[PDB]
Amino acid sequence: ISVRGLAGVENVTELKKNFNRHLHFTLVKDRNVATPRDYYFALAHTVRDHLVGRWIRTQQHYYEKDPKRIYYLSLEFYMGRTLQNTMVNLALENACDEATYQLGLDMEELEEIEEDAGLGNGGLGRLAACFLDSMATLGLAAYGYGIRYEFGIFNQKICGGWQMEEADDWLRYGNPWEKARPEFTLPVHFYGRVEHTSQGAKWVDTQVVLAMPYDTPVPGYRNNVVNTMRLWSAKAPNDFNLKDFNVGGYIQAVLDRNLAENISRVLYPNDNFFEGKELRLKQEYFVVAATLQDIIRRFKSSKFGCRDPVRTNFDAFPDKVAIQLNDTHPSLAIPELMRVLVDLERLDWDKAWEVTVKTCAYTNHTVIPEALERWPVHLLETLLPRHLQIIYEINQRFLNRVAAAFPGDVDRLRRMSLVEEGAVKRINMAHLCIAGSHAVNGVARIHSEILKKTIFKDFYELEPHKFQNKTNGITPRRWLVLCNPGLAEIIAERIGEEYISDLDQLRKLLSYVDDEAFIRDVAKVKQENKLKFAAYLEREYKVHINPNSLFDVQVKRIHEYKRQLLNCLHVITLYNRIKKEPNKFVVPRTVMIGGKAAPGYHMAKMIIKLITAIGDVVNHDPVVGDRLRVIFLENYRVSLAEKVIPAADLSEQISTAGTEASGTGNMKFMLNGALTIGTMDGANVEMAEEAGEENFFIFGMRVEDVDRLDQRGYNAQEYYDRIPELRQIIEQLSSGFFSPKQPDLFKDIVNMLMHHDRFKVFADYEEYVKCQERVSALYKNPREWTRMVIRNIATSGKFSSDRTIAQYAREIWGVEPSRQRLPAPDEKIP
């Protein structure tokens, strides 16, 4: 059937009865009233059974051996479905497929019932998920810590061409994967005030919110390792949240509990955009405060909570603990770790600081200003009084270091301050992380260089040793084996299976670049993938596409910097050229654009309307025929990604040079047989470098060109004046060609493009369409297109998250990865 494992005689039999056990005893249903949803759950529970045994021994193991623990703090974990992935990592796929088949059910149909765990916005959240899978696969004692939002990223609905947001009630039917652990609930404080008494400061009169943990297993790839992802849920104490007496109403007191519990209610739907709301700050401290108590408790036991030097010496804390900050969201971990160490454990400042810096590491994910976290002091002042005092003290000593290093450099001092003066004072969370971490890293080579050259230049000059780079990656398991079994199979037929956990081995595929059978095969799976997607499209969304055309897709969050607008300009151009010479042949294309716009991002929502507007015109022009279709992919999310990417021919990674930190979708397309048209931005540079620029479609300004243009000054009118095709498009938008009933509907877009385009869309227009012509040329030559594809796939090895994690492990955490199978799952009950 494929290498989805063995369909053993004994195990298929065993699976079936357990499937039935759960259907009866767990779901309390009988075959005569069971629905596909019920069947999905019976299976989910059956599969979940297979990893609890392993989950328990793994955790027990780490308790015995006591290795250094890695704590990944992130406010986002874009998990997606977990049934299939679990079967894959446990080598259960074929057996389950067989068993469910014999039970008369279609496993694939059941898999579609699983709701996505959308606790993330996009790139940042998904990275955390790929990281977890890699850390488990590499045998690291790692823990993912976050918040269990009951409402993840909103589900997107297109009404009349506009995006409509609606709550993502992903827990409505329950989550068979998590395990509530109410017995490990911890308290978290808010507000209050600081008392300075005799021997130390005291955080007093605080409001308490309880943090209840929920564990979700994270299985490594076929190594019997199952790590844990702990998500915190907000709960109100039953005392004060009722006991603070003297009139108000008993009923009202109980109803008001949903005020402390709102903390974990919903994820902020912003991608690369900072919103300074109190609720957000509350979420950030909540995950930090709870997690740290858990971290220290585990440390206090270790082998110190037995003997060792005997005396809670936190000197070995950094040797046993490592906490990674996914961006600045969990930045309060630094001042909080100090608070605990100094205020509660009573360590001197300097000893506490040394420990903190040695255990904390910060990862930067963006350079755009509107995404940078700068919290107003009055907010920290009211909500976390002691933490503000600690930050000021950290700032004081840091700046003193600076003054000593650069005597007289008074401007440098204000520039490096963690505190920003002006309208309202703010705290620069990024500056805080750099100061309190022993390592700071970018997520791609160019992004990391930009940090040292620009944004954190002064910091780099002060402590050059702190700065590193760790190019992002993706997990080959979900992003290849899971979503594209067809391609994984033909690859395995030639080079084996060892590449799933050693993607570098994909290079061996280079020697088949001229193999006639392979070229035919690679081309076949892609054709099958395109047919399956073209079908899914009419199944769930309804209105036909042509599987023979070039599948041009751009899927990512909607942003001005991602330039979906540039993509739009090209599409309209193609249309106009066809309308000019109708009977001229052109390579057919189905351009698919999908992504979510943050609810408050007006422009982004305006772009979504433009896309659909274009499709309205283009898709109903009889002269165009099936040569050009414009489709907006609704509710783009992980599960949808697993469907389009494998079916894509052209991958669009067209951000303005210097704005996309790294990107990861790009990597997903490269590993799945799509060719990339893009700018020298983020990881695109390293991808072209790995596959050879001749096998990549690069165009547009490089970072330097962008800066040159900024010195000069960017004037869009120039481009409008010298390019007739471009002029024609702008006037079509301005006159209502795409919006008859509402002629001025797109005035904001036009106005912005001509007068305030922060991402110079026009500057890259000419080189972009020229380059697009080159891909169409190559598409006309199937054999060569596929051979170039083989060049990309065979050279994408470097972009596996196993490589990234191996690097974090050695160069930052100080731990050695291991591909050693944990001693089987075998029963055991001590």
Added chain:
Amino acid sequence: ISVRGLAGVENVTELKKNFNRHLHFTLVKDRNVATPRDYYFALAHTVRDHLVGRWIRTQQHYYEKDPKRIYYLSLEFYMGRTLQNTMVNLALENACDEATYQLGLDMEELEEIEEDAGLGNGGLGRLAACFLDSMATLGLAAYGYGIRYEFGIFNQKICGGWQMEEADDWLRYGNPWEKARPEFTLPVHFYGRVEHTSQGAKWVDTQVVLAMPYDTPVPGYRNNVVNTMRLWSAKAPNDFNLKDFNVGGYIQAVLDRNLAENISRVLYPNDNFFEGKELRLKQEYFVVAATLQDIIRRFKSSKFGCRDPVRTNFDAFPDKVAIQLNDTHPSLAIPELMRVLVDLERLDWDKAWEVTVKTCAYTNHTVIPEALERWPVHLLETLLPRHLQIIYEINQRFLNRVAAAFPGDVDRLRRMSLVEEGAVKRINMAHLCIAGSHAVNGVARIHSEILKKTIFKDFYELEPHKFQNKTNGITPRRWLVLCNPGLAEIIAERIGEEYISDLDQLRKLLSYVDDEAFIRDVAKVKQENKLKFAAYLEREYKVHINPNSLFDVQVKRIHEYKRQLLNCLHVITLYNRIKKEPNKFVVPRTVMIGGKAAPGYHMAKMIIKLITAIGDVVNHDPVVGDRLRVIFLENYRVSLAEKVIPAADLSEQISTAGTEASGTGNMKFMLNGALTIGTMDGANVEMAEEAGEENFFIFGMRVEDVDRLDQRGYNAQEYYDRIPELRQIIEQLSSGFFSPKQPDLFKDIVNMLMHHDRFKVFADYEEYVKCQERVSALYKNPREWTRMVIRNIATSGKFSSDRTIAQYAREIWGVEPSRQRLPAPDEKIP
């Protein structure tokens, strides 16, 4: 060990492995970190397994055979713990005891970990629970329908002698008994307006709240019948509760979902007191609307949703459906059933009314005015516009019936109206229920007579046939076998086990009234029960009592009509007499008073403070010694009831004649070997009548005496003037004898007693203490005390809820009870 069933070889072995299965696979724990709470859950899940098989066949059975269905609508279901009760009804107690013993655990210690399902206030809620157990035991196709509050009756804490309320988070660790059924979610409407168009009225522009059902199994006693209790939970739709666009905030929209979900958040903590809050009315319509849709759906399938006359003829609705209204709380079921029938199914008014009256039955539970539900019209007008129109139309036609029956009786008309004029117009829910039901019943003989003679006199004259009586009862299983195995065993040793489901057989115990062995035994278990409680007291609450004294207990909600104050007066009297003649012998007594006060009931909370105040003085007077102890039993609830009742010698049922509809605690004490001192009120009359007045301690005014006094006019001063002992007590209260630091602390109590005592406490004082002297006299004669006890126990048979349900079944529902064992639980998987 006892007759808690057989401890079979094969089954104890089977239990153990399943216990371990769940500990591992369900709880995801290993013996080395498992705590008593974990062990409790493993067991709970193991036991729950044994009734799913039966639960599924029972429900399937009712689908095949299709009998008349009984729907018990109540806003309260005081369930208490369900582990033990389930073992008892399934004959699993000894096997589980054995198995857990072999696993090295103490089952009893594990049982104490289970949280009480406190979805009730007192008598009314607990009745619904005993009824459910009886309906299952009698093989009726019955369904309990209610609301799944996430916060039940508050947990009571005594701080400085005052009651402190705190949220009862009973779901904190989960509920292993319920089964969420999200797939059966139904919509419920609110607000909106009524449109009258061509062919009918339309309820339009309503706000929708979703109702999610949760099923809990209700096992009959050893008959393999497992009925269902369906509890509704409020959930917000994800559309409009987000989709009603045009600014407000996406985040705020999601946080505001906890506004529609507040409906099922908390139970109103009032006992015999009406609060006209909108939230309450919302809860009342919510449970009614959702339940009815479920009732009709089931009917539409029956055997009509196949063939029969073919044509949705609701003529047979009453032949297949019976809905019982537990008080007026679910009264909206009447106008709602009309709305559906008329508005949606399009039946003519008269046909719809005939059907409604024929399927609905109403049970009255009180006669005090402050407990009667009278909803302001403006509230119904805004929240349920169409229902108000239906009520007015029902009223119109009803009054016309009256006018026709009593021509010219204009005062009768206004008196009987469902609509009350005055300050604000109100709807008399009681009048609505009487008009739209084919039967109305009281809960005790005297209560039922009072209804016909007083409160519903006019209604009784109009339709004498509607009025009946159904004396309350209690379940011998939980209230005897479960809480008092020791007494159940010795009873079984003599007369067998058939009495557990046929309590009338207890009469055979009369012939052992002179048996020397029995008298010794009955006296022994009571002594053991008193020792176990005296221990529990120091274990969980701490501060010693004497197990040789007479255990005088009064446990029920705190009310002015229940007269805990009268009990107080006696206690203070005993104290004063001892202080007068210290060296005179008196029968030692431990008077225990426990109960909860509604949060807004000032007087009730003042009484709780008085009780503790008395104990402060009495319990620390060296001259008193161990002859008199005053203890306030904290957080009285079902689980606590199961502990005190079996250990009680004297049961206090001292309400003012004519105020306690029936009472059920009284019955609990009678069946458990306690003697009753009380007034001729509620079921007390029938209990004395059953045991012979010579074996009961009756005192005080009868209903007639109370009325005589009211004609005359009640003047408390008279009693104060003629009774020195009474005067002495009042002046002790007035001078701060019981409240040194705050001398005027009890001025409200004294003032009320002297000037506005609605329950003439003083009028029954003299006869009460005189009578109390008589019980002390008899207590001094162990042999005779125990013989009188045997007379009560042997004659309590009539008070089993099996008898009550058998009566409801035959005289109201039109169904025949059956003690036929359902065809085993045996595997089966069709």
